[PDB]
Amino acid sequence: KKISGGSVVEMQGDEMTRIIWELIKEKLIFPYVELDLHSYDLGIENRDATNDQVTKDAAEAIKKHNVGVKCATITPDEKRVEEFKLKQMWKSPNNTIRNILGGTVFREAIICKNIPRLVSGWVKPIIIGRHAYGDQYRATDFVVPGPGKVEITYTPSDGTQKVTYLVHNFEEGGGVAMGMYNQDKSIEDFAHSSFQMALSKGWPLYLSTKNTILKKYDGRFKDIFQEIYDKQYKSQFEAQKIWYEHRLIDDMVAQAMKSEGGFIWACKNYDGDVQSDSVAQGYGSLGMMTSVLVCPDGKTVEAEAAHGTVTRHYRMYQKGQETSTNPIASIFAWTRGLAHRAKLDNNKELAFFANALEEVSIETIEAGFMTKDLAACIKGLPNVQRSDYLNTFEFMDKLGENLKIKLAQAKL
Amino acid sequence: ISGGSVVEMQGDEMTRIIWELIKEKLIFPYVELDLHSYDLGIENRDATNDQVTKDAAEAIKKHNVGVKCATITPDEKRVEEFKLKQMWKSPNNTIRNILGGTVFREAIICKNIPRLVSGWVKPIIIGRHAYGDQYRATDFVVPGPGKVEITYTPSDGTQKVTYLVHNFEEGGGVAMGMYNQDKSIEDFAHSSFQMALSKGWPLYLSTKNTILKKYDGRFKDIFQEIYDKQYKSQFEAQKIWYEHRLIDDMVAQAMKSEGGFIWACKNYDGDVQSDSVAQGYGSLGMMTSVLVCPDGKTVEAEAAHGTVTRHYRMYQKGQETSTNPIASIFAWTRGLAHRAKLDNNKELAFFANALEEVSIETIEAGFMTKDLAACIKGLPNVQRSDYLNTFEFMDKLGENLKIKLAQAKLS
Ligand SMILES: NC(=O)c1ccc[n+]([C@@H]2O[C@H](COP(=O)([O-])OP(=O)(O)OC[C@H]3O[C@@H](n4cnc5c(N)ncnc54)[C@H](OP(=O)(O)O)[C@@H]3O)[C@@H](O)[C@H]2O)c1
Ligand SMILES: NC(=O)c1ccc[n+]([C@@H]2O[C@H](COP(=O)([O-])OP(=O)(O)OC[C@H]3O[C@@H](n4cnc5c(N)ncnc54)[C@H](OP(=O)(O)O)[C@@H]3O)[C@@H](O)[C@H]2O)c1
Ligand SMILES: O=C(O)CCC(=O)C(=O)O
Ligand SMILES: O=C(O)CCC(=O)C(=O)O
Numbered sequence: 001k002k003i004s005g006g007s008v009v010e011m012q013g014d015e016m017t018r019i020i021w022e023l024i025k026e027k028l029i030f031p032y033v034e035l036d037l038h039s040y041d042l043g044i045e046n047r048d049a050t051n052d053q054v055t056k057d058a059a060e061a062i063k064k065h066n067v068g069v070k071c072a073t074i075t076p077d078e079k080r081v082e083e084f085k086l087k088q089m090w091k092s093p094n095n096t097i098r099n100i101l102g103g104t105v106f107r108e109a110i111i112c113k114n115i116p117r118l119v120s121g122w123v124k125p126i127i128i129g130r131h132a133y134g135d136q137y138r139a140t141d142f143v144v145p146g147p148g149k150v151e152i153t154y155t156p157s158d159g160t161q162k163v164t165y166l167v168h169n170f171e172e173g174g175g176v177a178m179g180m181y182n183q184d185k186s187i188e189d190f191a192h193s194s195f196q197m198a199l200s201k202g203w204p205l206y207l208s209t210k211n212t213i214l215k216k217y218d219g220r221f222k223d224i225f226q227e228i229y230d231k232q233y234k235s236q237f238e239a240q241k242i243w244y245e246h247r248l249i250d251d252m253v254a255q256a257m258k259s260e261g262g263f264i265w266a267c268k269n270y271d272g273d274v275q276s277d278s279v280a281q282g283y284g285s286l287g288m289m290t291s292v293l294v295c296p297d298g299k300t301v302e303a304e305a306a307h308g309t310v311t312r313h314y315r316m317y318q319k320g321q322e323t324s325t326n327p328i329a330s331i332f333a334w335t336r337g338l339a340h341r342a343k344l345d346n347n348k349e350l351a352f353f354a355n356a357l358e359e360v361s362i363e364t365i366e367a368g369f370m371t372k373d374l375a376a377c378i379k380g381l382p383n384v385q386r387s388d389y390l391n392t393f394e395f396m397d398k399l400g401e402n403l404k405i406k407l408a409q410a411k412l
Numbered sequence: 413i414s415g416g417s418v419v420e421m422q423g424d425e426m427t428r429i430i431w432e433l434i435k436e437k438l439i440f441p442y443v444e445l446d447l448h449s450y451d452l453g454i455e456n457r458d459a460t461n462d463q464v465t466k467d468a469a470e471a472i473k474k475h476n477v478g479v480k481c482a483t484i485t486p487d488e489k490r491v492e493e494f495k496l497k498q499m500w501k502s503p504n505n506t507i508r509n510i511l512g513g514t515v516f517r518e519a520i521i522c523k524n525i526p527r528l529v530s531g532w533v534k535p536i537i538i539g540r541h542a543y544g545d546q547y548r549a550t551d552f553v554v555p556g557p558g559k560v561e562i563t564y565t566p567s568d569g570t571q572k573v574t575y576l577v578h579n580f581e582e583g584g585g586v587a588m589g590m591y592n593q594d595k596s597i598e599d600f601a602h603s604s605f606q607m608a609l610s611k612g613w614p615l616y617l618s619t620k621n622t623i624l625k626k627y628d629g630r631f632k633d634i635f636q637e638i639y640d641k642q643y644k645s646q647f648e649a650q651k652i653w654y655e656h657r658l659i660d661d662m663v664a665q666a667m668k669s670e671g672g673f674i675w676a677c678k679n680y681d682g683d684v685q686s687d688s689v690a691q692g693y694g695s696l697g698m699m700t701s702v703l704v705c706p707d708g709k710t711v712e713a714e715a716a717h718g719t720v721t722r723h724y725r726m727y728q729k730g731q732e733t734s735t736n737p738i739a740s741i742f743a744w745t746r747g748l749a750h751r752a753k754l755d756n757n758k759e760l761a762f763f764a765n766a767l768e769e770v771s772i773e774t775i776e777a778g779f780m781t782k783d784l785a786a787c788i789k790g791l792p793n794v795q796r797s798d799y800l801n802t803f804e805f806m807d808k809l810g811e812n813l814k815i816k817l818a819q820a821k822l823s
C-alpha cells in the first residue's frame with residue numbers, strides 16, 4: 001500500500017543529477033508514494049528542442065500546484081553550445097523560474113554527528129536567505145565594441161520627466177557594460193520572510209550589503225529592512241531576546257567565519273549564491289545542503305539541491321570509472337517539497353514519510369555508510385581508501401533498504 | 413637610512429591612531445624619507461571637496477610608491493556623524509580608478525596561530541581586479557513606474573544600441589549601470605599570469621559567465637587568449653596550469669584546498685573573498701594588500717581591513733582596546749621594499765624585511781593582540797594575561813626592531 005501523495009511538479013535535469021534523480025524516484029519515492037506528478041524534462045536537449053518553453057511551462061505548473069521539485073540543470077556557455085549543438089546560449093532555468101515565482105531561497109547545511117567540518121566554530125546552523133530575484137540574475141550585459149558612450153536612462157510612466165546617467169565614456173578601445181535592477185515589493189517580501197525565519201528559529205538576523213559603495217541601490221535594501229523591522233518586528237525580537245543588524249558584506253563574511261553559527265543570514269541574490277556554497281563546504285560537503293525557494297504568496301515552494309549537475313563526476317561515469325556522487329541534497333529536494341505538500345493537504349502519512357526519509361538519510365551516514373566526499377571529511381582526501389566509502393549505486397542501495405526497514409517499523 | 417620618495421596617505425579612526433605609532437616607533441627612529449604626506453582623513457576630504465584624494469593619486473603616479481592608511485567611506489549615518497557636505501566616494505575607489513592594476517592580497521602567517529579552515533597549509537594569493545564593476549558604477553532609485561534603458565553610442569555617432577533593463581509597471585525600486593575596459597582586463601590577466609609564474613603556483617580565475625555571458629565571458633575570453641598566445645609554454649614548463657571556474661565552484665574548492673594557488677578575482681569578489689580568506693587563516697589584521705599598477709613600476713600598499721570603528725569607539729570612551737597593527741605595519745614595509753627595489757637601495761630593503769621578521773617573531777614569541785589570542789584559546793576563554801593592548805604590542809615590536817637592527821649591524 002502506497003501514500004496518496006498529491007500534486008507535485010517535477011523538473012528533470014542533466015548529467016550526474018539526472019542519473020541520481022531517477023534512482024531516487026525508482027528506489028525511494030515511487031515504492032511508497034502515489035503522486036499526480038507533473039513532469040517537465042528540463043534537460044539541455046529538451047530545452048533546446050522546445051526553444052526553452054518547457055522552463056516557462058514548468059514555472060507556471062509550480063504557480064498552479066504550489067509544490068515543485070527541481071533536478072540540477074546545465075546553464076549553457078560557448079562550450080556547451082559546441083558540446084550539444086545548441087540553437088542558442090539559453091538562460092539558466094533557475095534564473096527563469098526564480099524570476100517568475102520570486103521569493104527567498106533558504107539554504108541550510110545537513111549535519112551528521114560523525115562528519116567533521118572544515119570550519120572549527122560552526123556548532124550551530126547558519127541559514128542563508130538568498131533573495132531569489134533581480135540583480136545579476138535578470139541583468140542586461142553587453143560588449144562595448146569600441147570608443148563610445150554608455151548611458152543608463154530612466155523615464156517615468158507619466159512622461160513628465162527623464163533622467164540620464166553617464167555610465168562611462170570609452171575614450172580608447174572597447175570593453176563591457178551592464179544594467180541591472182530590483183523592485184521594492186520583491187525586497188519587501190525578502191525582508192518580511194527574512195525576519196519571519198529569524199523568529200521561527202529564534203536566532204539573530206544579519207543583512208549584508210555594500211551600501212558604502214552602492215549608496216542608492218544597496219541603501220534601498222538597508223532602509224526597507226530597517227523600516228519594516230522598527231515598524232513591524234522590533235518588539236517581537238526583544239520578546240525572543242534576538243536582534244536584527246545590518247553589516248557590510250566584508251565584515252559579515254569575516255564575522256560568520258569566526259562565529260559559532262546560530263543566525264539567519266539575509267543575502268542579496270549574488271551573495272546568497274556564492275556564500276551558500278562557502279557555508280556548505282565549510283560544514284563538510286556541497287552535496288549536504290537543503291535549498292528551498294519560499295514564494296511571497298506563503299503557499300508556493302520550489303525545493304532543489306544547491307549544487308550543480310556534478311559534470312566532473314559524470315565524465316568519469318561516461319569513461320566507465322567508479323563514481324561516488326552525494327545524492328542527499330537531491331533527496332532532501334524531494335523530502336522538502338513533499339513536507340510542504342503534506343502541510344498544504346493536511347496529510348499525516350506524507351509528512352511522516354518526508355521526515356522518515358530525512359532521518360534515514362542522516363542515520364545511514366551516522367552508521368558509517370557514505371560517499372567519498374564524506375569519507376574525505378573523516379580521513380582527509382589523500383588518505384581515503386576504496387573500502388572507506390560506497391559508490392553512487394551502492395549508497396542508494398543502503399538508503400533504499402533502510403527506508404524499507406524504517407517504514408515497515410512505523411506500521412507497528 | 414635615506415628611503416627616497418614615499419607618498420603617505422593619512423587615514424581615519426583606529427588606523428589613524430596606529431599609523432602615527434608605526435611612524436613614531438618603527439619607521440622614523442630608523443628611516444628619514446621625502447614624505448609627500450596627504451591627509452585622507454574624513455575632515456580634510458570634506459574641507460578640500462575630495463580633491464586631496466585626486467592629488468594623492470596623481471602623487472603616487474609621479475613618485476611610483478604610495479602607502480595608505482584605512483579611511484571612512486561615508487554613508488547616511490556618517491554625514492550625520494561628521495556634518496558632511498556630501499556622501500563622498502571611497503578614497504580607495506578614486507585611487508584604484510586613477511592608478512589601475514591588480515590588488516594582490518595575502519595572509520601573514522605565524523607558526524603558533526591556529527586557523528579556522530583546517531586545510532590551508534600553503535598560502536592563497538588573491539589577484540583582485542582594482543578597476544571598474546561595482547566600484548565605478550552608477551546606481552540610483554526608481555521612484556515609480558517607468559522604463560530603465562541602458563544604451564551604447566559609438567564615437568562616430570552613426571549607430572545607437574538601447575537595451576531595456578526593466579520596465580517597472582507597478583511601483584519603483586533600484587537600478588544601476590556598471591562597466592569595465594578591455595585594456596584593464598588585459599592588464600589584470602598579465603599581472604595574474606606573471607604572479608603565478610613568479611610564485612610557481614597554478615592560477616584560477618573565477619567568474620559568473622554562465623549568467624553574465626557577455627560581461628564575464630569577456631574576462632574568460634581575454635585570460636584564455638593571453639594564456640594560449642603568451643604564457644601556456646611558460647606555465648607547462650613549471651608543471652603549473654591556468655583554469656577558469658564559476659565563482660560557486662571556486663569558493664567551495666578554496667575552502668577544501670591546501671592553498672598554494674593564485675586566485676584571480678573580479679573587483680567585488682576580491683573585496684569579499686580576501687576577507688573570508690584572511691579570517692579563515694586567523695584574523696583581519698593578519699593580511700598584506702598591494703596594488704601593482706600596469707606599468708609594473710607603480711605600487712600602492714595598504715591594510716586590507718577597515719578603520720576598526722568598534723575598537724575606535726572604546727578608545728574614544730577612554731577604554732584600553734587591543735587592535736592588530738601588523739596589517740598596517742606591512743603597508744609600510746611593502747612600500748619601503750618596493751621603493752628600495754626601484755632605487756636599488758640595500759639598507760632600506762634589509763630594514764623593510766627586518767621589520768616583517770620582528771613582527772612575526774614577536775607573535776611566535778607569545779606577545780600578541782586579542783584577535784591572535786582568540787585563535788589560540790577561543791574567544792570565550794581569553795584572559796587579559798593572554799594578550800597585550802595596542803600600545804604594549806607596539807612597545808614590544810619597537811623594542812625588538814631595536815634589538816634586530818643593532819644585532820644586524822654585527823655589533
Ligand atoms: N541548481 C542548479 O541547476 C545549478 C547550480 C549550480 C550549477 N549548475 C550547473 O551545473 C553545471 C556544472 O557546474 P560546476 O561543475 O561548476 O558545479 P557543481 O556541479 O556543483 O560541481 C562542482 C564540484 O563540486 C563538487 N560537488 C558538487 N555537488 C556534489 C555532490 N552532490 N557530491 C560530491 N561532490 C559534489 C564536486 O567537486 P570535486 O570534483 O572536487 O569532487 C564537483 O566537481 C554547470 O552547467 C552549471 O550551470 C546548476
Ligand atoms: N581599505 C579601507 O580604507 C577600508 C576597508 C574596509 C572598510 N573601511 C571603512 O572602515 C569603517 C569600518 O569598517 P567595518 O566596521 O565594516 O570593518 P572593520 O574596520 O574591518 O572592523 C570590523 C570588525 O573587524 C574586526 N577587525 C578588523 N580589523 C581588525 C584589526 N586590525 N584588529 C582586530 N580586529 C579587527 C573587528 O572585529 P570584532 O568586532 O570581533 O572585534 C571589528 O569590529 C567603515 O567606515 C568603512 O568604510 C575602510
Ligand atoms: O543557474 C545556474 O547556472 C547555477 C545556479 C546556482 O548557482 C545556484 O542556484 O546556486
Ligand atoms: O573602499 C572601501 O570602502 C573599502 C573596501 C574594502 O573593504 C577593501 O579595501 O577591500
Ligand SMILES: [Ca+2]
Pocket residue numbers: 273274277306307660
Ligand atoms: Ca550556487
Ligand SMILES: [Ca+2]
Pocket residue numbers: 250683684686687716717
Ligand atoms: Ca575588503
